[PDB]
């Protein structure tokens, strides 16, 4: 059987790369060719295109946040599952101010108005969600590794779920 042979090849190739250091944890010296490229192109490209373009975009983004009166982390959409899992565990103090800012932003945006300049002198790029994003990612990675390492088989279209993995009832068209 040729499948049994492939299973040995896969088993032996993975046993030979256990404990390997990830590519980003290896001290890496750039190739001489890359070094020449990074001394001619990168400098000029930053001074003429990247630098100005990305400052133009960044400054506009800061202004838009200041007009809405919101922080950068407020802009995250909770349809993303990492954001949702983080928002479960934020403290109430952070949670209360986050809601009020988002509410004011939507009112202003809907009514085509902008926050009074008196209230716009703040740093919108303060990463207040960072601790909880990292915790959420850790929790999700554990679940991924310890509970979702195989494409499991389940009875299909039973109990209001397709059996293909989703956990909420009536969350697909075919599950109505």
């Amino acid at each position: 059987s040729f499948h049994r042979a492939f299973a040995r090849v896969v088993c032996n190739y993975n046993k030979s790369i256990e404990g390997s250091v990830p590519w980003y944890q290896v001290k890496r010296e750039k190739s001489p060719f890359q070094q020449v490229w990074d001394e001619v192109f990168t400098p000029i490209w930053f001074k003429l295109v990247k630098g100005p373009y990305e400052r133009w975009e960044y400054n506009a983004l800061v202004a838009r946040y200041r007009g809405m009166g919101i922080m950068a982390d407020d802009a995250m959409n909770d349809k993303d599952m990492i954001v949702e899992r983080a928002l479960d565990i934020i403290p109430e103090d952070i949670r209360i101010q986050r809601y009020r800012r988002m509410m004011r932003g939507a009112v202003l945006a809907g009514r085509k108005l902008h926050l009074p300049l008196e209230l716009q002198n703040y740093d919108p790029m303060v990463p207040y969600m960072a601790p909880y994003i990292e915790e959420a990612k850790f929790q999700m990675q554990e679940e991924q590794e310890l509970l979702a390492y195989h494409p499991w088989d389940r009875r299909l279209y039973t109990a209001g779920v397709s059996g293909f993995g989703e956990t909420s009832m009536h969350s697909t068209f075919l599950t109505m």
Partner: protein
């Protein structure tokens, strides 16, 4: 009374989305194979034929006249 207590959701909270991964792989495959055809027929192929036709100036063994 009071605010709801914080608790993590028992997971996994992701999964069940294989149809979207199929569309990704099908679309990438089709469009990757369209790139090969368009790159070949519109640029490479034409230039290759010209080279071969100018490699017939050597005419050591150019195509025979009859050989029908």
């Amino acid at each position: 009374i009071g605010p709801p207590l914080r608790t993590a959701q028992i997971g996994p909270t992701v999964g069940g989305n294989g149809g979207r991964t199929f569309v990704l792989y099908l679309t990438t495959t089709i469009n990757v194979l369209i790139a090969f055809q368009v790159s070949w027929a519109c640029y490479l192929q034409p230039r290759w034929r010209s080279f071969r036709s100018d490699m017939l100036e050597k005419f050591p063994s150019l195509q025979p006249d009859m050989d029908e």
